[PDB]
Amino acid sequence: VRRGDFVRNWQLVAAVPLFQKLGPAVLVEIVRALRARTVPAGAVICRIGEPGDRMFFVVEGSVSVATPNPVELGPGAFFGEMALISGEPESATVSAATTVSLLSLHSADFQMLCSSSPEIAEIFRKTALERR
Amino acid sequence: VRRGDFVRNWQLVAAVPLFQKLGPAVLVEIVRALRARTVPAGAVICRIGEPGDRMFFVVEGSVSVATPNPVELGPGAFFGEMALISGEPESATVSAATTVSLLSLHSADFQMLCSSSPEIAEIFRKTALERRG
Ligand SMILES: Nc1ncnc2c1ncn2[C@@H]1O[C@@H]2COP(=O)(O)O[C@H]2[C@H]1O
Ligand SMILES: Nc1ncnc2c1ncn2[C@@H]1O[C@@H]2COP(=O)(O)O[C@H]2[C@H]1O
C-alpha cells in the first residue's frame, strides 16, 4: 500500500461507524486493505447476477439498490455483503444515487475482518438476513 | 494505546509535513507512540536547564522559544530535539504563544523514529546545529 492512499483512508474510515468496533491493530489491517473510489451519479457499482468478489462502505453521498422497491443507502452503510456471506451471485444492481465516495473491501480481507471481529461478523449476518 | 487516541492521532499527524517521509508501517509505530496535548496560551511546555526526556511537534497554534531573541514556532515545527541529540539539558524554556495543539514523543520513541527514518534523523541533527549556532 502507498502512503498516500493509506493516510487518505484514515480520514475516510471515520465516516463508517461500524469500524469504531475495531481496536488499533485490527483497524490498521482493514485500513491497509481498503481502496477508495468515487462513482459519478447514476453509475453502476455492482450488477445483479454477477459473482461478488468485494463489498463496499459508503463514505459520502448515497447509493441506490435496485430491489423491486429500491433502497437508498447513506454514509456509514455497506453493501455487497450478501454475496460474500452466501457465496451466491449479487442479489441486486447497486448504482450511485448521487456522486458517491466509497471504500471497497475484497473477499479475502472481508473474511479476515469477520474472523478478527465477532461483533462485526454478526452485524453483517443479521443485516444480510434482514435484507434477504 | 486507546482506540480513541490512536484514531485522533491520524488527523493530527497530517499537520506535520515531516511525517510524509514515513511509509505505512513506520507511520503506524509513530502514531502509536505519539501523545496529543493542548496547552493554554502563555503556559510552560519545556523548561531551560531541565533534562530532556521527550520532544514536541506543533499541530495547531504556536509556541515561543525563550532564547535572547525569542523564536515563534508554527504548525509542523518541532522542539526539544537538541537535548535528545546532545544529551545536554534543555537549552531554552518553550511556552505556548497562542493556545497550541501538540504531539509529544518520548526519548525511547525518538530513537526509534531516527533509526526508522535516517532522513528525519538528519533534519533533527542539522536543525539542532542551526539552532545551537
Ligand atoms: N432488501 C435490501 N435492502 C437493502 N439492501 C439490499 C437489499 N437487497 C440487497 N441489498 C444490497 O445490494 C447488494 C447486491 O449485492 P449482494 O447480494 O452481495 O449484497 C446486496 C446488499 O448489500
Ligand atoms: N535559536 C533557536 N531557535 C529556535 N528554536 C530553538 C533555538 N534554541 C533552542 N530552540 C528550541 O527549544 C528547545 C529547548 O529544548 P532543547 O534544547 O532540547 O531543544 C530546543 C530547540 O528545539
Curated annotation (Swiss-Prot), chain A:
Ranges in the topological domain labelled Cytoplasmic: 1-132
Residues reported to bind 3',5'-cyclic AMP: 80-81, 90-91, 131
Subcellular localization: Cell membrane
Domain of life: Bacteria
Reported impact of residue 131 to A: Loss of cAMP binding. Loss of channel activity
Signal peptide (UniProt feature, chain positions): none
Family from the record: Belongs to the potassium channel family.
Subunit comment: Homotetramer.
Described function: Cyclic nucleotide-regulated potassium channel activated by cAMP.
Name of this chain's protein: Cyclic nucleotide-gated potassium channel mll3241
The species this protein was found in: Mesorhizobium japonicum (strain LMG 29417 / CECT 9101 / MAFF 303099)
Entire protein: shown range: 218 to 349 of 355
